[PDB]
Design an enzyme around this catalytic site. Structure first.
Site, PDB file in Angstrom:
ATOM      1  N   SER A 153       0.846  -1.202   0.000  1.00  0.00           N
ATOM      2  CA  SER A 153       0.000   0.000   0.000  1.00  0.00           C
ATOM      3  C   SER A 153       0.888   1.261   0.000  1.00  0.00           C
ATOM      4  O   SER A 153       1.701   1.447  -0.893  1.00  0.00           O
ATOM      5  CB  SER A 153      -0.914  -0.024   1.234  1.00  0.00           C
ATOM      6  OG  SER A 153      -1.703   1.146   1.311  1.00  0.00           O
ATOM      7  N   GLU A 213      -9.425  -5.354  -5.908  1.00  0.00           N
ATOM      8  CA  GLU A 213      -9.088  -3.992  -5.493  1.00  0.00           C
ATOM      9  C   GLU A 213      -9.732  -2.947  -6.386  1.00  0.00           C
ATOM     10  O   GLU A 213      -9.627  -3.024  -7.617  1.00  0.00           O
ATOM     11  CB  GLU A 213      -7.569  -3.796  -5.524  1.00  0.00           C
ATOM     12  CG  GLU A 213      -6.872  -4.180  -4.226  1.00  0.00           C
ATOM     13  CD  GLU A 213      -5.390  -3.891  -4.277  1.00  0.00           C
ATOM     14  OE1 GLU A 213      -4.621  -4.852  -4.433  1.00  0.00           O
ATOM     15  OE2 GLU A 213      -4.999  -2.707  -4.245  1.00  0.00           O
ATOM     16  N   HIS A 249      -7.724  -5.273  -1.108  1.00  0.00           N
ATOM     17  CA  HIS A 249      -6.558  -4.481  -0.759  1.00  0.00           C
ATOM     18  C   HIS A 249      -5.844  -4.990   0.499  1.00  0.00           C
ATOM     19  O   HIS A 249      -4.620  -5.143   0.531  1.00  0.00           O
ATOM     20  CB  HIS A 249      -6.995  -3.032  -0.565  1.00  0.00           C
ATOM     21  CG  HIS A 249      -5.859  -2.099  -0.314  1.00  0.00           C
ATOM     22  ND1 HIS A 249      -4.906  -1.828  -1.270  1.00  0.00           N
ATOM     23  CD2 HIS A 249      -5.449  -1.476   0.818  1.00  0.00           C
ATOM     24  CE1 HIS A 249      -3.976  -1.048  -0.747  1.00  0.00           C
ATOM     25  NE2 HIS A 249      -4.267  -0.843   0.525  1.00  0.00           N
TER      26      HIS A 249
HETATM   27  C1  LIG Z   1      -6.079   2.567   9.861  1.00  0.00           C
HETATM   28  C2  LIG Z   1      -5.121   2.362   9.104  1.00  0.00           C
HETATM   29  C3  LIG Z   1      -3.967   2.373   8.120  1.00  0.00           C
HETATM   30  N1  LIG Z   1      -3.864   1.087   7.396  1.00  0.00           N
HETATM   31  C4  LIG Z   1      -4.710   0.754   6.408  1.00  0.00           C
HETATM   32  O1  LIG Z   1      -5.684   1.441   6.107  1.00  0.00           O
HETATM   33  C5  LIG Z   1      -4.419  -0.574   5.673  1.00  0.00           C
HETATM   34  C6  LIG Z   1      -3.419  -0.309   4.518  1.00  0.00           C
HETATM   35  N2  LIG Z   1      -3.879   0.806   3.650  1.00  0.00           N
HETATM   36  C7  LIG Z   1      -3.054   1.745   3.116  1.00  0.00           C
HETATM   37  O2  LIG Z   1      -1.853   1.825   3.372  1.00  0.00           O
HETATM   38  C8  LIG Z   1      -3.698   2.835   2.220  1.00  0.00           C
HETATM   39  C9  LIG Z   1      -3.939   4.091   3.095  1.00  0.00           C
HETATM   40  N3  LIG Z   1      -4.987   3.908   4.131  1.00  0.00           N
HETATM   41  C10 LIG Z   1      -5.075   4.697   5.232  1.00  0.00           C
HETATM   42  O3  LIG Z   1      -4.216   5.523   5.547  1.00  0.00           O
HETATM   43  C11 LIG Z   1      -6.311   4.478   6.142  1.00  0.00           C
HETATM   44  N4  LIG Z   1      -7.542   4.326   5.334  1.00  0.00           N
HETATM   45  C12 LIG Z   1      -8.430   5.328   5.141  1.00  0.00           C
HETATM   46  O4  LIG Z   1      -8.249   6.469   5.575  1.00  0.00           O
HETATM   47  C13 LIG Z   1      -9.458   5.080   4.207  1.00  0.00           C
HETATM   48  C14 LIG Z   1     -10.218   6.151   3.723  1.00  0.00           C
HETATM   49  C15 LIG Z   1     -11.206   5.962   2.746  1.00  0.00           C
HETATM   50  C16 LIG Z   1     -11.456   4.702   2.205  1.00  0.00           C
HETATM   51  C17 LIG Z   1     -10.704   3.630   2.675  1.00  0.00           C
HETATM   52  O5  LIG Z   1     -10.834   2.358   2.207  1.00  0.00           O
HETATM   53  C18 LIG Z   1      -9.729   3.822   3.646  1.00  0.00           C
HETATM   54  O6  LIG Z   1      -9.005   2.723   4.007  1.00  0.00           O
HETATM   55  N5  LIG Z   1      -4.916   2.366   1.477  1.00  0.00           N
HETATM   56  C19 LIG Z   1      -5.012   2.354   0.104  1.00  0.00           C
HETATM   57  O7  LIG Z   1      -4.085   2.686  -0.645  1.00  0.00           O
HETATM   58  C20 LIG Z   1      -6.173   1.772  -0.468  1.00  0.00           C
HETATM   59  C21 LIG Z   1      -6.146   1.372  -1.814  1.00  0.00           C
HETATM   60  C22 LIG Z   1      -7.241   0.746  -2.429  1.00  0.00           C
HETATM   61  C23 LIG Z   1      -8.408   0.504  -1.713  1.00  0.00           C
HETATM   62  C24 LIG Z   1      -8.461   0.893  -0.380  1.00  0.00           C
HETATM   63  O8  LIG Z   1      -9.555   0.694   0.409  1.00  0.00           O
HETATM   64  C25 LIG Z   1      -7.369   1.515   0.223  1.00  0.00           C
HETATM   65  O9  LIG Z   1      -7.489   1.836   1.542  1.00  0.00           O
HETATM   66  N6  LIG Z   1      -5.702  -1.130   5.158  1.00  0.00           N
HETATM   67  C26 LIG Z   1      -6.246  -2.293   5.605  1.00  0.00           C
HETATM   68  O10 LIG Z   1      -5.669  -3.041   6.400  1.00  0.00           O
HETATM   69  C27 LIG Z   1      -7.542  -2.620   5.133  1.00  0.00           C
HETATM   70  C28 LIG Z   1      -8.188  -3.771   5.616  1.00  0.00           C
HETATM   71  C29 LIG Z   1      -9.473  -4.121   5.186  1.00  0.00           C
HETATM   72  C30 LIG Z   1     -10.162  -3.320   4.273  1.00  0.00           C
HETATM   73  C31 LIG Z   1      -9.543  -2.168   3.797  1.00  0.00           C
HETATM   74  O11 LIG Z   1     -10.110  -1.287   2.921  1.00  0.00           O
HETATM   75  C32 LIG Z   1      -8.267  -1.835   4.216  1.00  0.00           C
HETATM   76  O12 LIG Z   1      -7.755  -0.674   3.707  1.00  0.00           O
HETATM   77 FE   LIG Z   2      -9.187   0.865   2.588  1.00  0.00          FE
END
Ligand SMILES: C#CCNC(=O)[C@H](CNC(=O)[C@H](CNC(=O)CNC(=O)c1cccc(O)c1O)NC(=O)c1cccc(O)c1O)NC(=O)c1cccc(O)c1O
Ligand SMILES: [Fe+3]
Length: 267
Positions: A153, A213, A249
């Site tokens: 990610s 994704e 994802h």
């Molecule tokens: C709390 C916390 C920080 N960690 C995460 O969010 C991680 C890893 N994710 C990332 O590093 C980034 C950055 N994520 C963040 O910093 C926290 N997420 C959010 O703020 C968020 C906002 C709007 C929509 C989302 O799905 C979010 O996850 N996500 C993406 O690039 C991404 C890409 C495609 C589809 C997605 O849903 C993504 O999230 N995500 C997950 O473990 C996860 C698990 C189940 C379902 C998910 O959608 C997840 O993102």
């Molecule tokens: Fe997410």
């Protein structure tokens, strides 16, 4: 939101033993714990090959016993999970800052997703070189020509930033579900000039993405497909893209790590 998996750490019955090495960021704001998995096997003459994993609180949770037993094939790697000092599986603030590149234009640089400070990629990669590797090397002999860097990610974004802007620090770069969408594809611009920067070096790039994704969290696979097509043309760069049928994802983190660790070790 969720706790990390300590069970593995305190265990004794596998061919790896895990120990912690602690460091802080240069600016004093972020607090690291590197979890070092050392094979019971003695090091090769030139040192252990080394696999560095971002989001390490999570990455340790994804190291299964089956993988760890197979890794001990007589050329086992040193495993280094770069985590944050916290109970949590994931450190939102730390990772947001450490794994995102700077966007020159911006003053207070803030994640377009969660609004936290971003742009610490180069400081993080500098700390890996100038503080982490020094500490890890003191604990076990390293083969610095056989190093792998993995991330998921935003961690994958980091990995691409490392390859694109500072190639050759690692032999193998492994980016799972890299957040190519970030800042409307800003990472894609950093790739310009790569072939020139790679001159006199050889490097391997592994990419993963899950079939389920979305294109971003708010046209699926297009960006990745175009990136792969581009990088395929780069002299010196060996590219392996692996699509992961049936994963979204979050799930590509563990999948990519298990699959990475099942690959042939770096030369
Ligand atoms: C709390 C916390 C920080 N960690 C995460 O969010 C991680 C890893 N994710 C990332 O590093 C980034 C950055 N994520 C963040 O910093 C926290 N997420 C959010 O703020 C968020 C906002 C709007 C929509 C989302 O799905 C979010 O996850 N996500 C993406 O690039 C991404 C890409 C495609 C589809 C997605 O849903 C993504 O999230 N995500 C997950 O473990 C996860 C698990 C189940 C379902 C998910 O959608 C997840 O993102
Ligand atoms: Fe997410």
């Amino acid at each position: 939101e969720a706790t990390m998996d300590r069970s593995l750490l305190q265990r004794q019955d596998l061919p790896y033993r895990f120990s912690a090495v602690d460091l802080d960021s240069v600016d004093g704001q972020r607090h690291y714990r590197l979890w070092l998995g050392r094979p019971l096997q003695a090091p090769p003459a030139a040192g252990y090959p080394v696999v560095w994993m971002l989001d390490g609180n999570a990455a340790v949770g994804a190291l299964d016993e089956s993988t760890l037993r197979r890794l001990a094939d007589g050329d086992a790697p040193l495993l280094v999970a770069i985590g944050y000092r916290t109970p949590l599986r994931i450190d939102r603030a730390g990772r947001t800052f450490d794994y995102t590149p700077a966007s020159p234009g911006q003053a207070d640089q803030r994640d377009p997703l969660n609004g936290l400070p971003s742009g610490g990629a180069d400081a993080f990669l500098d700390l890996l070189r100038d503080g982490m590797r020094p500490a890890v090397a003191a604990q076990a002999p390293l083969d610095t020509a056989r190093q792998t860097l993995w991330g998921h990610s935003y961690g994958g974004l980091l990995v691409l930033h490392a390859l694109f802007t500072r190639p050759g620090e690692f032999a193998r770069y492994a980016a799972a579900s890299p957040s190519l969408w970030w800042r409307d594809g800003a990472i894609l611009g950093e790739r310009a000039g790569l072939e020139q920067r790679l001159r006199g070096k050889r490097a391997e790039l592994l990419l993963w993405r899950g079939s389920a994704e979305p294109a971003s969290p708010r046209e699926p696979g297009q960006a990745m497909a175009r990136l792969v097509d581009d990088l395929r043309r780069v002299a010196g760069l060996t590219l392996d893209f692996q699509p992961l049928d049936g994963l979204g994802h979050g799930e590509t983190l563990g999948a990519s790590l298990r699959l990475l660790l099942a690959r042939p070790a770096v030369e």
